[PDB]
């Protein structure tokens, strides 16, 4: 099963500066975000192999 | 027995009398709720709608200020977004009744705006930030613009805040009406008028209209006194509606002109500083619909008797103790009147 190496930490927006959320796991082929119950659009995700 | 006056025998015990008393309480509460429900829902609807509409206006104004900063002063972003967001957040918090100082909103807005103007527009090229913030007010760089905006927005925001508070207090008192607990003597009189006929073995006999009138005018002597203050509340709200959408929407032109005004004296300023350092339709329809309920407290005992089963003819009716051929004949209210006096003074002072 996939083991998370870099689990997302609760971010805080300061002075309207958009801060992205990090996610790193191995072994992983597909990683998606579920923000507030629903899936996040494919375009918003930025994958690194 | 302690309620049903026993003239002959009786078909009910003391526990059945307590059951009849509790059913009398529940019937009175149901009648009051049915009387007050339409007005309660009217004021709740209008409160919700006006709240959302004011929030829409504030959001649109914040969006336009951010957009006009993006378009005309890209050198001031993203700091411009910060102080605009803080300003309109404090705006909304003041509209919703929080302790926010309007003069402090405008002063913090210009205090944050001046240093980025100086560093990015006038003298291109963090620790000296406070010296610029002090120089903003000490040299009056923005002229009369801050006081103009201060009065312009304080005048509208205070009337809107008090409009919302008035709507909420109307909701509060109309909710309070149907929860008015009455005296024990009135409980016994209502039990006699509605149920004690069943203890004497009568099945369909209704109480006399005059007996209902004496009982209702007996326990609503306090509630009827609210009518003067409720009428004054309605009329003062009408006085207030006769403001804030137009003001918040012209703010962008004024801010742009203030930035131009400060840039106009940059020559002397840079050297000195370098050395030193459909709404109106809705409220109209609301007032016209609210004037239809001006008799609410005066017509309330009439409502209780006209919606309770009574013999209007006063013939072959129940008089609380026997079947006759013809009929013979504070604290919570004080708080309601106190709050009405307060809100009425607050209304009248605004307009
Ligand atoms: C938000 O900004 C956009 C872009 O200029 C604008 O078209 C829109 O009217 C604004 N909306 C509000 C709520 O201000």
């Amino acid at each position: 099963l996939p083991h998370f190496i870099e689990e997302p930490e609760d971010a805080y927006i300061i002075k309207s500066n958009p801060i992205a959320l990090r996610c790193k796991a191995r072994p992983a082929m597909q990683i998606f975000f579920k923000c507030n119950g629903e899936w996040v659009h494919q375009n918003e995700h930025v994958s690194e192999e | 027995l302690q309620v049903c006056l026993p003239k002959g025998p009786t078909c009910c015990s003391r526990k059945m009398e307590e059951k009849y008393q509790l059913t009398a309480r529940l019937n009175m509460e149901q009648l009051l709720q049915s009387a007050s429900m339409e007005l309660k829902f009217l004021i709740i609807q209008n409160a919700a709608v006006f709240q959302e509409a004011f929030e829409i206006v504030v959001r649109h104004a914040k969006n336009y200020t951010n957009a006009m900063f993006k378009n005309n002063y890209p050198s001031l972003t993203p700091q411009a977004f910060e102080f605009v967001g803080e300003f309109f957040t404090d705006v909304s918090l003041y509209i919703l009744g929080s302790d926010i100082n309007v003069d402090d909103m405008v002063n913090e807005l210009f205090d944050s705006l001046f240093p980025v103007i100086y560093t990015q527009m006038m003298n291109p090229g963090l620790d000296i930030n406070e010296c610029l913030r002090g120089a903003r007010r000490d040299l009056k760089v923005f002229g009369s613009f801050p006081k103009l905006i201060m009065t312009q927005v304080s005048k509208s925001l205070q009337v809107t805040r008090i409009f919302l508070q008035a709507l909420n207090l109307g909701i509060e008192v109309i909710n309070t009406t149907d929860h008015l607990k009455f005296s024990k003597d009135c409980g016994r009189m209502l039990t006699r008028m509605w149920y004690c006929s069943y203890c004497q073995g009568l099945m369909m006999v209704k109480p006399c209209g005059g007996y209902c009138n004496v009982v209702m005018q007996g326990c609503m002597a306090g509630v009827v006194e609210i009518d003067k203050y409720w009428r004054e509340y309605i009329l003062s709200l009408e006085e207030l509606v006769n403001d804030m959408e137009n003001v918040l929407l012209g703010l962008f032109s004024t801010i742009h002109d203030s930035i131009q005004y400060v840039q106009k004296n940059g020559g002397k300023l840079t050297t000195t500083i370098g050395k030193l350092c459909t709404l109106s339709s809705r409220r109209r329809e609301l007032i016209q619909k609210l004037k239809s309920f001006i008799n609410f407290y005066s017509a309330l005992p009439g409502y209780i008797c006209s919606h309770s089963p009574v013999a209007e003819n006063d013939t072959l009716c129940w008089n609380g103790q026997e079947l006759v051929e013809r009929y013979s004949q504070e604290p919570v209210v004080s708080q309601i009147i106190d709050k009405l006096k307060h809100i009425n003074q607050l209304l009248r002072t605004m307009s």
Side-chain angles (χ1 to χ4, degrees):
Chain A
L1 294 160
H3 182 266
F4 293 93
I5 306 127
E6 282 173 59
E7 273 181 276
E9 195 189 83
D10 44 294
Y12 302 99
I13 193 123
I14 306 147
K15 278 159 189 187
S16 70
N17 296 295
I19 294 131
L21 284 153
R22 302 199 175 184
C23 200
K24 203 173 195 174
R26 189 185 76 156
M29 46 217 71
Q30 277 280 63
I31 289 166
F32 281 95
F33 273 84
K34 219 184 206 286
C35 294
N36 301 283
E38 274 188 287
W39 296 110
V40 182
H41 203 275
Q42 195 71 70
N43 296 339
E44 305 284 296
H45 291 82
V46 181
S47 297
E48 161 81 74
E49 288 78 85
Chain B
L1 298 173
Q2 310 198 24
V3 179
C4 257
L5 297 163
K7 291 194 169 188
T10 174
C11 293
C12 76
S13 51
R14 179 67 180 99
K15 296 171 189 178
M16 308 190 199
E17 192 168 74
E18 297 174 350
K19 294 181 168 184
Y20 281 140
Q21 288 172 254
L22 84 89
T23 61
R25 274 183 69 108
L26 288 169
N27 204 17
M28 186 59 152
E29 295 167 2
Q30 173 66 82
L31 274 166
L32 292 176
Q33 205 287 322
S34 292
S36 68
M37 159 263 190
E38 222 303 298
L39 170 61
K40 206 190 307 176
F41 286 172
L42 168 60
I43 317 186
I44 285 171
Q45 280 180 342
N46 279 255
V49 162
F50 279 119
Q51 192 282 323
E52 183 55 30
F54 294 145
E55 186 60 18
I56 291 167
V57 167
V58 174
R59 261 146 40 194
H60 184 257
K62 175 221 196 308
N63 245 62
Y64 209 83
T65 310
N66 279 147
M68 176 295 289
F69 266 102
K70 255 168 290 189
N71 289 127
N72 301 265
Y73 302 106
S75 43
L76 302 186
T77 65
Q79 303 93 325
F81 297 168
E82 291 159 27
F83 62 59
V84 167
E86 278 160 307
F87 177 85
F88 282 101
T89 290
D90 284 336
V91 164
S92 60
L93 291 199
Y94 179 89
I95 305 307
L96 304 186
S98 176
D99 189 20
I100 293 279
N101 193 303
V102 180
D103 296 40
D104 293 4
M105 283 192 268
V106 178
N107 268 327
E108 210 257 325
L109 172 56
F110 284 98
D111 281 338
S112 315
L113 169 64
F114 179 69
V116 48
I117 287 186
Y118 190 79
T119 58
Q120 316 290 3
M121 298 219 69
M122 293 194 281
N123 180 82
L126 293 180
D127 291 349
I128 192 184
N129 194 268
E130 271 59 43
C131 197
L132 287 184
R133 290 180 133 258
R136 196 280 291 181
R137 325 161 77 105
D138 284 355
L139 285 109
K140 312 164 183 300
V141 298
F142 285 97
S144 63
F145 278 95
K147 296 289 156 177
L148 171 61
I149 292 173
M150 268 178 212
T151 68
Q152 249 178 359
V153 304
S154 67
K155 156 267 202 171
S156 45
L157 295 215
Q158 216 179 34
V159 52
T160 303
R161 151 192 268 244
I162 205 174
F163 179 69
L164 287 168
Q165 279 181 331
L167 288 188
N168 288 292
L169 185 124
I171 289 173
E172 196 179 337
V173 306
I174 296 309
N175 158 303
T176 303
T177 71
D178 49 281
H179 306 291
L180 283 187
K181 302 311 159 195
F182 289 107
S183 73
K184 296 190 172 187
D185 182 65
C186 181
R188 294 193 279 272
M189 289 200 310
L190 292 172
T191 319
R192 275 186 277 249
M193 178 189 60
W194 277 329
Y195 301 122
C196 188
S197 76
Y198 296 129
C199 287
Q200 206 165 279
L202 295 172
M203 295 165 167
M204 46 73 56
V205 171
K206 303 147 184 52
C208 319
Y211 179 54
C212 189
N213 286 359
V214 295
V215 168
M216 226 47 63
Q217 301 289 341
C219 350
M220 305 264 284
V223 188
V224 162
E225 295 179 347
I226 306 189
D227 190 60
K228 157 68 195 294
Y229 308 95
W230 171 260
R231 291 179 119 96
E232 193 194 339
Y233 161 85
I234 296 284
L235 295 163
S236 298
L237 194 59
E238 178 182 55
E239 189 176 45
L240 264 74
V241 50
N242 282 342
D243 275 300
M244 164 214 194
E245 194 166 56
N246 310 74
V247 172
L248 288 191
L249 274 180
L251 269 191
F252 333 99
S253 59
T254 311
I255 294 176
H256 164 276
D257 289 4
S258 73
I259 297 167
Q260 301 289 298
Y261 182 73
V262 167
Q263 288 207 109
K264 115 181 181 182
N265 252 270
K268 298 188 170 195
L269 212 69
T270 63
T271 71
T272 307
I273 287 166
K275 294 192 190 168
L276 194 268
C277 300
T278 179
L279 257 185
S280 86
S281 77
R282 289 176 184 176
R283 42 226 290 265
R284 273 184 288 154
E285 187 89 12
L286 170 55
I287 289 290
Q288 215 68 47
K289 265 180 175 192
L290 230 57
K291 287 169 71 179
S292 55
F293 296 95
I294 199 164
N295 276 306
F296 175 83
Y297 283 93
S298 46
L300 209 58
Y303 182 97
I304 301 298
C305 287
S306 61
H307 287 58
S308 60
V310 302
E312 57 288 321
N313 199 9
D314 286 2
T315 61
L316 282 188
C317 58
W318 181 256
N319 74 345
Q321 46 175 299
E322 72 176 339
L323 174 62
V324 306
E325 199 89 57
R326 289 172 180 178
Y327 180 57
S328 61
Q329 294 188 340
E330 282 216 27
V332 50
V333 181
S334 70
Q335 187 191 12
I336 295 169
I337 300 178
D338 285 332
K339 300 187 195 174
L340 280 176
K341 284 174 164 178
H342 183 32
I343 192 71
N344 290 349
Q345 179 171 83
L346 263 169
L347 284 150
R348 289 245 185 250
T349 60
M350 287 311 110
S351 63

